[PDB]
Amino acid sequence: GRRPARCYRYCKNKPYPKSRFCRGVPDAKIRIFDLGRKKAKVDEFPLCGHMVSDEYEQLSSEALEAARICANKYMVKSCGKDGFHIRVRLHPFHVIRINKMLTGMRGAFGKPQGTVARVHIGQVIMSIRTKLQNKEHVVEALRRAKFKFPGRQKIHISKKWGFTKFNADEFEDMVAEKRLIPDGCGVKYIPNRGPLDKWRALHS
Amino acid sequence: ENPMRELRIRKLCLNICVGESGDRLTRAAKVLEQLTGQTPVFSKARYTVRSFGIRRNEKIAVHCTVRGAKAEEILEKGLKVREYELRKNNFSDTGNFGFGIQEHIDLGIKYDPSIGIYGLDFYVVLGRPGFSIADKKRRTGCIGAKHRISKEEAMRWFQQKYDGIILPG
Amino acid sequence: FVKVVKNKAYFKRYQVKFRRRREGKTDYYARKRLVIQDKNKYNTPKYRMIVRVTNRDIICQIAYARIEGDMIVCAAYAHELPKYGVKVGLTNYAAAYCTGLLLARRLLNRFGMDKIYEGQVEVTGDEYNVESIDGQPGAFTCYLDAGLARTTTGNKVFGALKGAVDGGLSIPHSTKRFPGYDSESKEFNAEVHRKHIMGQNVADYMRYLMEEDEDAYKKQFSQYIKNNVTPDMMEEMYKKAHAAIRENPVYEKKPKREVKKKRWNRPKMSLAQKKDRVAQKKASFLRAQERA
Amino acid sequence: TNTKGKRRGTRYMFSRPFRKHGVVPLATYMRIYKKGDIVDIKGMGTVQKGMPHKCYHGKTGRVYNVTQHAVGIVVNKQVKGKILAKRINVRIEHIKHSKSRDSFLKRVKENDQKKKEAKEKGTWVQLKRQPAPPREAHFVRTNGKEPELLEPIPYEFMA
RNA sequence: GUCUACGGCCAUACCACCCUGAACGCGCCCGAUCUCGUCUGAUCUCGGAAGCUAAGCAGGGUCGGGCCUGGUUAGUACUUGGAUGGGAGACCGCCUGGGAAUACCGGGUGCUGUAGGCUU
RNA sequence: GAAACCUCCCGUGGAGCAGAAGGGCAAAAGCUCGCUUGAUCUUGAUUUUCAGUACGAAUACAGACCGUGAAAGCGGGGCCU
RNA sequence: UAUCCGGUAAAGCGAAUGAUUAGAGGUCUUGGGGCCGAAACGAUCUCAACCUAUUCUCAAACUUUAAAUGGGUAAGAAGCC
Numbered sequence A: 001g002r003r004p005a006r007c008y009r010y011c012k013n014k015p016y017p018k019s020r021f022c023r024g025v026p027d028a029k030i031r032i033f034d035l036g037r038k039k040a041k042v043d044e045f046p047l048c049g050h051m052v053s054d055e056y057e058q059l060s061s062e063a064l065e066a067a068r069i070c071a072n073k074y075m076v077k078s079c080g081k082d083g084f085h086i087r088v089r090l091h092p093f094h095v096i097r098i099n100k101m102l103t104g105m106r107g108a109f110g111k112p113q114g115t116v117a118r119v120h121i122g123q124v125i126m127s128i129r130t131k132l133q134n135k136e137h138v139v140e141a142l143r144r145a146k147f148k149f150p151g152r153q154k155i156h157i158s159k160k161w162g163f164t165k166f167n168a169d170e171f172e173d174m175v176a177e178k179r180l181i182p183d184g185c186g187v188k189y190i191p192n193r194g195p196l197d198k199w200r201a202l203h204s
Numbered sequence B: 001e002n003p004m005r006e007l008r009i010r011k012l013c014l015n016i017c018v019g020e021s022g023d024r025l026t027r028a029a030k031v032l033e034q035l036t037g038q039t040p041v042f043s044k045a046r047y048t049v050r051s052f053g054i055r056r057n058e059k060i061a062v063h064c065t066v067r068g069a070k071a072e073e074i075l076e077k078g079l080k081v082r083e084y085e086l087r088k089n090n091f092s093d094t095g096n097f098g099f100g101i102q103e104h105i106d107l108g109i110k111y112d113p114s115i116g117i118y119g120l121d122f123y124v125v126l127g128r129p130g131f132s133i134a135d136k137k138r139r140t141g142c143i144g145a146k147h148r149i150s151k152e153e154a155m156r157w158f159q160q161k162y163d164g165i166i167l168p169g
Numbered sequence C: 001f002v003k004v005v006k007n008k009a010y011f012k013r014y015q016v017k018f019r020r021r022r023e024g025k026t027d028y029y030a031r032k033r034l035v036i037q038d039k040n041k042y043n044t045p046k047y048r049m050i051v052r053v054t055n056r057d058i059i060c061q062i063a064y065a066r067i068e069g070d071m072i073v074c075a076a077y078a079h080e081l082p083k084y085g086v087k088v089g090l091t092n093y094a095a096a097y098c099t100g101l102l103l104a105r106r107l108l109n110r111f112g113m114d115k116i117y118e119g120q121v122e123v124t125g126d127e128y129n130v131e132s133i134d135g136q137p138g139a140f141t142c143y144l145d146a147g148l149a150r151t152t153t154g155n156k157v158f159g160a161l162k163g164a165v166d167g168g169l170s171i172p173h174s175t176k177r178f179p180g181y182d183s184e185s186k187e188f189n190a191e192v193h194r195k196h197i198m199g200q201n202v203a204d205y206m207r208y209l210m211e212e213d214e215d216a217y218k219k220q221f222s223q224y225i226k227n228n229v230t231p232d233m234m235e236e237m238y239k240k241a242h243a244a245i246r247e248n249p250v251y252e253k254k255p256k257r258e259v260k261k262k263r264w265n266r267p268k269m270s271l272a273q274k275k276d277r278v279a280q281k282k283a284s285f286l287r288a289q290e291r292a
Numbered sequence D: 001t002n003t004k005g006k007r008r009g010t011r012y013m014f015s016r017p018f019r020k021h022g023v024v025p026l027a028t029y030m031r032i033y034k035k036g037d038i039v040d041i042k043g044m045g046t047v048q049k050g051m052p053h054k055c056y057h058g059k060t061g062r063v064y065n066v067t068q069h070a071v072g073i074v075v076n077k078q079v080k081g082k083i084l085a086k087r088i089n090v091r092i093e094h095i096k097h098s099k100s101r102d103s104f105l106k107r108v109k110e111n112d113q114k115k116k117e118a119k120e121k122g123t124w125v126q127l128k129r130q131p132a133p134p135r136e137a138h139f140v141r142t143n144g145k146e147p148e149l150l151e152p153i154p155y156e157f158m159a
Numbered sequence E: 001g002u003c004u005a006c007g008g009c010c011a012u013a014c015c016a017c018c019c020u021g022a023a024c025g026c027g028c029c030c031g032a033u034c035u036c037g038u039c040u041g042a043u044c045u046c047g048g049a050a051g052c053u054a055a056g057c058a059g060g061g062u063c064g065g066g067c068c069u070g071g072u073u074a075g076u077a078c079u080u081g082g083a084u085g086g087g088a089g090a091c092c093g094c095c096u097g098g099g100a101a102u103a104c105c106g107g108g109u110g111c112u113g114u115a116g117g118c119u120u
Numbered sequence F: 001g002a003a004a005c006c007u008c009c010c011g012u013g014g015a016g017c018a019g020a021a022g023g024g025c026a027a028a029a030g031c032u033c034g035c036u037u038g039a040u041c042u043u044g045a046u047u048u049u050c051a052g053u054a055c056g057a058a059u060a061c062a063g064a065c066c067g068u069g070a071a072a073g074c075g076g077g078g079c080c081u
Numbered sequence G: 001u002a003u004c005c006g007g008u009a010a011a012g013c014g015a016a017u018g019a020u021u022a023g024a025g026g027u028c029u030u031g032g033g034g035c036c037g038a039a040a041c042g043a044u045c046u047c048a049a050c051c052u053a054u055u056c057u058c059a060a061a062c063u064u065u066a067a068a069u070g071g072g073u074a075a076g077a078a079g080c081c
């Protein structure tokens, strides 16, 4: 049906998003960019395993989805149906083209074949949060998920708390301070600045 | 002991939307002219609506803005036919109120088989001293804040002045 | 509830209009046409006879525009007029005339063209304008800056403009909006105009009220009744004032001194005060809640 | 092949900057150009009468003519192999005084000061400029405290 | 100290709500005979001066938003010139000079020209 | 009645400006009135394509005769391409 | 050495435009489907769009920012007084 992944790998063209101009684009294979217990509280999942990319390459929507199932399947089988949260952090926005041959190279300009993610060197592909129990189960999940992607991707466990931007060493104190306040999957960082009436809702 | 926070009637607005044009509208314009003691204005439609049977720039409604003592007098008549009751929803958050009358002859006008029974629409722009700031030409402004009439404040003016009830629901 | 119209975003993207455009003062559309010179004129001034009527006052200024902030060569106010003769009705058309006239005379006295360009003396009211005399310094010429005033027939600005024209400034104008000119005929009386210049429109209203009801007259013309300005006294009064202006227009100010130098205002609260003030509100909240 | 249209590609060039739209504030108009004023051209979107062509934006040149509300201005425009000094009639709004020349005039004025004085004295003074010379010999006192050692830091992978 | 008229630069000047304003101003304010204009003396025009700072206006306030300006981000991202450097490629490292932008954290919150007041 | 007409509030333009898109534009360049024919007559200069020839299109002036506005001004077609 | 010009790399999207993930919060709206309701903004979920802070990820024909390399001028007798 579709072309080999070989042929759309390197980030060669300018980014060609689905827009006014580029239309009639077929929908991306991947759709659900996160799954597992996504309705979980910051506190009850701090681990944050990442699959980072080490190639400035393009990943297919097809390969993302496949990798996502692969990781989630293992996470379910391993720990449990509601024991993790996985986030895919690359959406296929770039539209990829296809000049098709039954005229020759005259007036050759592609129709939209499919979509694709462009991924920089050092950029995270997938990311998983679960417990301090469960580190090894994530690693292998991401390990298995590597095999669905072309190029090369390290698996890495971050020094953050969960899917927060905050360093896990200081996360718990900050809550004690109320620097930080739980807010679904995330956590709202409160600063000094805002009128004092906001400060009177806390400390009360 | 307030000096000029004296909530007054800035203007009274009266409109008969017949939604016809031609003769019905010319007929209804006489009713306001008998009531207010001044020629009204015909407003035209914004755009055609095949449902209502109106066309763009076709004269739909007649209306007029009464000011001063005559607006106080006509407002009084309009409340007498309504029996000095309003509701909470009849007041706008801006501190204005309004109410219908179902037939102008109730106010105190003679019917005619031609010049029939045009129901009409009172609406009262309440105001204060020094609201004109907004609408003058040169050094304009906005009327502060503790000076703006609240919904509550306009209800209590009605509850005092015209001895009204403001029934709930 | 609704979508907040005035977000962070709104204010980030927001552009203010100029300061005086905000204050509701300066029509910059008109200012550009008024004030800028033709570049090949170079640094030669472009004067304008600014006239603004305040609720209690009429100011008449002559100004050109430099880049630092348009400079004012001369001015006359309606509140000066007491010197000359005018006790009351200082925002009235007649007063506007005196105030304009006075500006012309005071201006002319600076340049030494007080003796040349006497201008119109008898006050006809008709189309008058100044012809510059050959072998003599030319006639001063500015243009009327009406401002935001709705320029209609009989507007008081044109009362001032008429005055400065009779005072001997060549300011171009038509008579299409002096009070007198008829809309549904298109001729100019210039006796109606004279009446207005002399305050006879005011005197007749005074005579009309006194005839009808004493109390309304007494209410309407309270400062006219005090100072004893009567209807029959009115025309003479303005003619005296015109002469006195015409004989001595020079402004002398008052020698202002003996000032205590005290702050009526409230000065700006220093960082450190503001910093503590929240500190005290923080403490006071804590000590307050540790009770109930 | 691209369109020859006058305004092609001036989407950004002739576009008032961020939060500087609206009234062309008045100094702009009311400042005087004589003959032989050095003047830098910079087209503007609000005023479309007397706009310069996109080629002369950025370019500086001298004023030759001054009309009522514009200024003729000789500017040099390169064309493949030949520089053509050519004369264009820009409306004031698209033009500033180029300061480039004033720093020169400041220096010549300063020279005339330093030539009048130092003549009766006898001591001749350096009027020519000189490029930044090598930075001279000097001591550095490590006052009490010794130097601070800088080990390069061990790598770690952050993302 | 501060205002009015005409301003220049146009948020350090905007917005929100809160407080305070002596004198002079500026206003709101009271009228429609005349000028002028409205469906309407609301606006506009005109004649006033009994009230009042309620509002506009000014000055201040807010762990305020916004804007302005520093730090950090970071010698990071990018990048001129160099090599028979690496790497299967993708890309990367070095040399040679140049060098940013958010988030985050500080500080600031109109200056001033001409003419004329008031605080004598 | 989700939509008719009226009224108060907010509203940096998120509308509109014949048409493609881009720019520009708020006591306007938008809308609504009033008066109009500068879309008129006539020299050269200049810009843009450029060979630095033409055409078209435009820019600044200058001389006439008008328009409009209290005026300063603006206007010799269409906000600019 | 002075001085203008710039909107590409980068960056940004808790700034506009457009795209786009997630949960917190919200009878804003209202609905369509429910379950417990005669029915009830009653209770309970829900999914629609909208909104209040956050959050994931983007742009040749988006952008508040904004490089490097780069293009003008100027650096005197044709000047000063």
Ligand SMILES: [Mg+2]
Residues within 6 Å of the ligand: none
């Ligand atoms: Mg094959």
Ligand SMILES: [Mg+2]
Residues within 6 Å of the ligand: A012, A013, A014
């Ligand atoms: Mg390609």
Ligand SMILES: [Mg+2]
Residues within 6 Å of the ligand: C030
């Ligand atoms: Mg005007």
Ligand SMILES: [Mg+2]
Residues within 6 Å of the ligand: E041
């Ligand atoms: Mg009135």
Ligand SMILES: [Mg+2]
Residues within 6 Å of the ligand: E053
């Ligand atoms: Mg006040």
Ligand SMILES: [Mg+2]
Residues within 6 Å of the ligand: none
């Ligand atoms: Mg107050």
Ligand SMILES: [Mg+2]
Residues within 6 Å of the ligand: none
């Ligand atoms: Mg702040």
Ligand SMILES: [Mg+2]
Residues within 6 Å of the ligand: none
């Ligand atoms: Mg047009």
Ligand SMILES: [Mg+2]
Residues within 6 Å of the ligand: none
């Ligand atoms: Mg001509």
Ligand SMILES: [Mg+2]
Residues within 6 Å of the ligand: none
């Ligand atoms: Mg470009």
Ligand SMILES: [Mg+2]
Residues within 6 Å of the ligand: none
């Ligand atoms: Mg980019």
